[PDB]
Each structure stands twice: as structure tokens, then as C-alpha cells.
Ligand binder design. Structure first.
Ligand SMILES: CNC(=O)c1ccc(C)c(-n2c(C)cc(OCc3ccc(F)cc3F)c(Br)c2=O)c1
Ligand SMILES: Fc1ccc(-c2c[nH]nc2-c2ccnc(F)c2)cc1
Length: 337
């Protein structure tokens, strides 16, 4: 076992192996705190995440397991992966803290959209990278569900990775079918979010700044139109249909006019991503092949993920069982060497 050393950072205690030095808090992100650090073994700058109350309840214990499982699975340049996972506990009975370690990126897409206004060329490269990561995640039967600029980490190299998959005001990037509470949504939920993000990078403003679920829907429908007959036929919920069909009908706007000065390829991709009916929305793989990404696209360099066992998601287990499963996964971890 390595030697651990202990310190307090913003009320939080951190017990990490001596290999990680100069810890510096870089913010709380719900369910955990993050420090930047220097990894003496690799020479790399890393982010270390301490999970908050990983075993507080069955929900938390299952969530801790899920995140560790997801992170051990993801091995892709545009998806956050694991350099290390550790606990200061020397046995299962002593196990109550999980630390997760990844390459430090040091910014997010908000930190890039803000005050700086990106060229079409930067937009192509950033969105290419999101789609490249999404192709991979989607190939493992994983849906992000909460893609937004603050979940997209970007380094000084303009290299991007998706954070917080499978687990700043999130509702602005949410697919309309989720605002309506549909339980059978598909992976193109994430493509909607990409469309909202891409629009924001092109225009410098939030495409749909909703104040609540209902206001969000209204803003979406003014751009994309109220549902046509084919989509209306697909809504089971009487309450949902009463509401939608009770709104004043709106036509789909002309995207070429809304995004007036943008690359006409960017506009074309936007309208394929922001299709109301999720069954008609472009997939991540299809989007990568869109002419907008001509300068970046290579099918031989856009890998798919190994099979991911999500069967645990259906299981109703005790806290101690989720805890022991998580311990097993910490101990079996094999670093990228
Ligand atoms: C405030 N300045 C920063 O250094 C700064 C600014 C913005 C961001 C998104 C970040 N930042 C954050 C928060 C988390 C982060 O990774 C979290 C994280 C995920 C998985 C894991 F196994 C270990 C981790 F730790 C990275 Br990687 C990162 O880069 C840092
Ligand atoms: F106002 C609306 C109406 C429908 C959607 C929608 C988009 N894609 N799929 C749906 C959908 C399909 C089946 N049942 C639902 F409830 C929703 C979104 C907003």
C-alpha cells in the first residue's frame, strides 16, 4: 500500500497517497469536491474528486457504484476516464471514502463561450469532439442526459472531454421530450443538447433560456414549431397532449434566418439536430459524417466502446452490497499502463 497523508481543504478532509502533491480546490460539482494536484509518478497535472457521502443511502451507494463502473469503462480521448481510484481504508469494514483521479483539463465550455467569441473553425473542432465522444458513449448503450457547457471540460489545447455522463442551469439544454416527462426517450436526447450548445457557441447566447419546465417548452416550440400530426400521434399522455394542443400553433422557423450569419453547413447541421420529433433527429455517428466536419472527420479514428454491462441498474440491493461491489471495483482497478 502507498503512504497516505491527511489535510483539510474548505472544511473537507482529504486523505490521498503521497504521490499526489499540491492539492488545490477547483470547486464542488454536486455529490463531490475536486482538487487540482500534481502526480509525482507520472509528471501529470490531475484532478482528484472525493465523493461526498458515497454510502449515505441506497441511492448514493448505487450512484457511487455506477460512477466508478462508468469511469472504469470509458477509454476514449473525448470522454473523462480514470488514471487512478483509491481509498485510505485498508479493509471493507473501514471503507467509507472514494477518491477518483483523472487528467486535469482546467476549464469548461462556459469558460470559453464567455466574453470570447469563437470562430466557425473553433466551433467545428469543439462540436466534432463532443460528437466523437458521444458516438463512443452511445455505442455502450449509455445516454448522458444532462449535457451542458459546464459538463464539457476543455484544456489549453482546445481538446475536449465529456464529464458527468450516465449519472450552468441544466434545463436550458434539455430535450423537449424530457420537459414533457416522456419515459421512453432515446439517445438523441444528447443530440438536442449538442444542438443547443452549438447554437450558443455560434451566437454567444443561450438558445432556450427557460425560467421553468413550461416556459422552456414554449421557447423551444417557437423555434421548432408545435408538433405536427405524425409526432402528435406518438404522445400517449392525455395531460401532455391537452397542454401541447392547447398552445397557439407555431410554424417551424427558418433556421437560415434565425442563425443569419453562420456557416450554411452549421445551419444545416443545426436543423438536423434540433428536430422536434426525436425519431427524426440525427445520431452522433451520422452527424460526424456531415459535411460541416469535413476537415476533422475520419471513420477509422472515431472508435466505438467495448460492451458495457448495465444489468446492475435493474437491481435492488442493500447499502452494504453496493458498498462491497464498489470496494471490489476499487481493488480490481488496473491503471492505463
Ligand atoms: C477552476 N479551474 C480549474 O482547474 C477547473 C476549471 C473547470 C473544470 C471543469 C475543472 N475540472 C473539474 C471541475 C473537474 C474535473 O474532473 C472531475 C473528475 C472526474 C472524474 C474523475 F475520475 C476525477 C475527477 F476529478 C476536471 Br478533469 C477539470 O478540469 C477544473
Ligand atoms: F411538445 C412536445 C411534444 C412531443 C415531443 C417529443 C419529441 N420527441 N418525442 C416526443 C414525444 C414522443 C412521445 N411521447 C411524448 F410524450 C413526447 C416534445 C415536445
Amino acid at each position: 500500500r502507498p503512504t497516505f497523508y491527511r489535510q483539510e481543504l474548505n472544511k473537507t478532509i482529504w486523505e490521498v497517497p503521497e504521490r499526489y502533491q499540491n492539492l488545490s480546490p477547483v470547486g464542488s460539482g454536486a455529490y463531490g469536491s475536486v482538487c487540482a494536484a500534481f502526480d509525482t509518478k507520472t509528471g501529470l497535472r490531475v484532478a482528484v474528486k472525493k465523493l461526498s457521502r458515497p454510502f449515505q443511502s441506497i441511492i448514493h451507494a448505487k450512484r457511487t457504484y455506477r460512477e466508478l463502473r462508468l469511469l472504469k469503462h470509458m477509454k476514449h480521448e473525448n470522454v473523462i476516464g480514470l488514471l487512478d481510484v483509491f481509498t485510505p481504508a485498508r479493509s471493507l469494514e473501514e471503507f467509507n471514502d472514494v477518491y477518483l483521479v483523472t487528467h486535469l483539463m482546467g476549464a469548461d465550455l462556459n469558460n470559453i463561450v464567455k466574453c470570447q467569441k469563437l470562430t466557425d473553425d473553433h466551433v467545428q473542432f469543439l462540436i466534432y469532439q463532443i460528437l466523437r465522444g458521444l458516438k463512443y458513449i452511445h455505442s455502450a448503450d449509455i445516454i448522458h442526459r444532462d449535457l451542458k457547457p459546464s459538463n464539457l471540460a476543455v484544456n489549453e489545447d482546445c481538446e475536449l472531454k465529456i464529464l458527468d455522463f450516465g449519472l450552468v442551469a441544466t434545463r436550458w439544454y434539455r430535450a423537449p421530450e424530457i420537459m414533457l416527462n416522456w419515459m421512453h426517450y432515446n439517445q438523441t436526447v444528447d443530440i438536442w443538447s449538442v444542438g443547443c450548445i452549438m447554437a450558443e457557441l455560434l451566437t454567444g447566447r443561450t438558445l432556450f433560456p427557460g425560467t421553468d419546465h413550461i416556459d422552456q417548452l414554449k421557447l423551444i416550440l417557437r423555434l421548432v414549431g408545435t408538433p405536427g400530426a405524425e409526432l402528435l400521434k406518438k404522445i400517449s399522455s392525455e395531460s401532455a397532449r391537452n397542454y401541447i394542443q392547447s398552445l397557439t400553433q407555431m410554424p417551424k422557423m427558418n433556421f437560415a434566418n434565425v442563425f443569419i450569419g453562420a456557416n450554411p453547413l452549421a445551419v444545416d447541421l443545426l436543423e438536423k439536430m434540433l428536430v422536434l420529433d426525436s425519431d427524426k433527429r440525427i445520431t452522433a455517428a451520422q452527424a460526424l459524417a456531415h459535411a460541416y466536419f469535413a476537415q476533422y472527420h475520419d471513420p477509422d479514428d472515431e472508435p466505438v466502446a467495448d460492451p458495457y454491462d448495465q444489468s446492475f441498474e435493474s437491481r435492488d440491493l442493500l447499502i452494504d452490497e453496493w458498498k462491497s461491489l464498489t470496494y471490489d471495483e476499487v481493488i480490481s482497478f488496473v491503471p492505463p499502463p
